[PDB]
Design a protein around this ligand. Structure first.
Ligand SMILES: Nc1nc2c(ncn2[C@@H]2O[C@H](COP(=O)(O)OP(=O)(O)O)[C@@H](O)[C@H]2O)c(=O)[nH]1
Length: 524
């Protein structure tokens, strides 16, 4: 069928990186291959009018959230993961609306703090991971050691697919480990199809006349070790999230990028079956389905447009179709909704399973909302994430407590911020993932709700959701740790911890108590 075909082309993925790894550099070089030259320049330019400044305050992002582009007859949906000033909870959430992930690692650094946390988010869905080691034009760690670093630190098996030849001032090129080809690193080239120097084999004549006899011999030495030690690429493993094919390159020069992109579109998974409150929803179904996973402000001179982001999981979207908002129950007509075909010639008014659409939100869409054509079904798997920045609410005029908690609880629905009411206090504690969510709730509470407020930091570092079967044994825990407990906007029990250390002690004192770092956004 027409849907099954279009879904089979889709490659929906995001990049996970520690900052300054190369995420925006490597995004540009791929937008080049998709023919999105116009967007490619604005993404590199992302490194002023008065009303756009106020819009920066309301929560818009300069870089486009979603970048779709075609490559080798596949449709590549590249969902952004803002890592800089706009880092926040939405960054963690984007990963739950993809099927595959590309990890970028600086070779000088290695695995880094943001690498580790993003990779943990991918472990939740067992998302497949591909690895690209960046910045080989400058000196860095040994590849053999960097593989063990990934393996031991990140926990995932390593199956390299390309392999470097030197690095830094001494970099000569990569060697493909499946095709046997030997791409060369050299100037004046964009490293594309016709614009590259590719030997078909290591034993091809003249290779030593190009990479030096010494470096060819040391390359034979390194391969013999990788062959008899590192594991070869097992697609079944990669698909189950238990293995990552590794690529080495130099994104700033587009070197090694294309082999990665060709390998990616060949093997990365097409849209798969997600789960709902009961039955599994396959991507080949006739009716349209999908879940809202992100809500942001859309660049608006009226400073009033919010757009909820929705990934499509079955059927076909067409501009102006009647949808079924399972929660509210009202028929919703997706009017003037947003597609993200970023290409100077290509322009498409529809979207297929794996794509993302932008539903202009007027206030009644919250995170995790499931849109269908009439089937009462509700997607599961959409998580809320344990905050990592906590602050208390500071209101100058106390006559706005009624309206403050009204605004706050709604900002929780739309994913602005989480909102915690301690069992032994009327304080209101706002958990976020990035600093920016606080300035946003500031403006939004003032602008929308008229509550001039402030957020002073508290002695809270991490939070865990609490669940336990035994009704009495939980109450022996509710009254024991009550000072450290709160309720969130959903009414779940949250252990607000002053430190990671206090939490581990808390986890051990209560052996029969579940401490989980995630929670479904559907009040359950
Ligand atoms: N030497 C070298 N520098 C790079 C490479 N890729 C990115 N950079 C540099 O890293 C800086 C910004 O990297 P960026 O793409 O913005 O990483 P991001 O912050 O994770 O998006 C720039 O100064 C780039 O010149 C590379 O392959 N080699």
């Amino acid at each position: 069928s027409e849907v099954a075909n279009e879904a089979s082309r889709r490659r929906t993925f995001a990049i996970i990186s520690h900052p300054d790894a190369g995420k925006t550099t490597l995004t540009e070089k791929l937008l080049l291959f998709g023919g999105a030259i116009q967007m490619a320049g604005s993404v590199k330019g992302r490194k002023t009018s008065d009303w756009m400044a106020l819009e920066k305050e309301r929560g818009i992002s300069v870089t486009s959230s979603v970048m779709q582009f075609p490559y080798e007859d596949k449709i590549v949906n590249l969902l952004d993961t803002p890592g800089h000033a706009d880092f926040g909870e939405d960054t963690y959430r984007v990963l739950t609306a993809v099927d595959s992930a590309l990890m970028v690692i600086d070779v000088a650094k290695g695995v880094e703090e943001r690498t580790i946390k993003l990779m943990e988010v991918c472990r939740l869905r067992d998302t497949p991971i591909m690895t690209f080691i960046n910045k080989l034009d400058r000196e860095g760690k040994d590849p053999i050691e960097l593989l063990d670093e990934v393996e031991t630190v990140l926990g995932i098996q390593c199956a390299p697919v390309t392999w470097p030849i030197g690095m830094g001032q001494r970099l000569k090129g990569v060697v493909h480990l499946l095709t046997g080809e030997v791409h060369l690193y050299e100037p004046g080239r964009n490293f594309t199809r016709q614009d590259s120097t590719i030997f078909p084999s290591i034993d091809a004549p003249g290779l030593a006349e190009k990479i030096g006899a010494q470096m060819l011999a040391d390359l034979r030495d390194e391969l013999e070790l990788v062959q008899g030690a590192s594991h070869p690429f097992d697609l079944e493993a990669y698909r189950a999230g238990k293995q990552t094919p590794v690529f080495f390159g130099s994104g700033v020069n587009n070197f090694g990028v294309q082999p990665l992109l060709d390998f990616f579109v060949e093997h990365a998974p097409s849209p798969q079956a997600r789960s709902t409150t009961g039955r599994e929803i396959a991507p080949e179904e006739n009716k349209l389905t999908g879940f809202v996973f992100k809500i942001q402000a859309n660049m608006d001179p009226q400073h009033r447009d919010r757009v909820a982001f929705m990934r499509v999981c079955s059927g076909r979207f067409s501009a102006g179709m009647k949808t079924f908002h399972v929660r509210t129950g009202k028929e919703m007509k997706l009017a003037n909704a947003l597609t993200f075909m970023a290409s100077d010639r290509e322009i498409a008014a529809e979207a297929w399973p794996g794509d993302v659409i932008g539903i202009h939100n007027h206030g009644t869409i919250s995170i995790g909302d499931t849109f269908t054509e009439g089937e009462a079904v509700t997607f599961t798997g959409i998580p809320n994430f344990a905050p990592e920045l906590f602050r208390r609410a500071r209101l100058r005029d106390p006559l706005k407590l009624k309206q403050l908690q009204k605004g706050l609880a709604q900002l929780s629905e739309e994913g602005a911020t989480q909102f915690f009411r301690p069992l032994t206090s009327n304080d209101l504690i706002l958990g976020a993932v990035g600093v920016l969510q606080f300035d946003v709730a500031a403006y939004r509470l003032k602008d929308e709700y008229g509550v001039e407020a402030t957020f002073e930091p508290v002695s809270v570092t991490t939070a865990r959701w609490v669940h336990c079967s035994n009704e009495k044994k939980l109450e022996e825990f509710r009254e024991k740790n009550a000072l450290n407990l709160a309720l969130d906007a959903a009414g779940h029990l949250v252990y607000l911890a002053p430190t990671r250390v206090n939490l581990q002690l808390a986890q051990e004192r209560s052996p029969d108590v579940r401490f989980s770092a995630t929670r479904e956004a559907a009040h359950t």
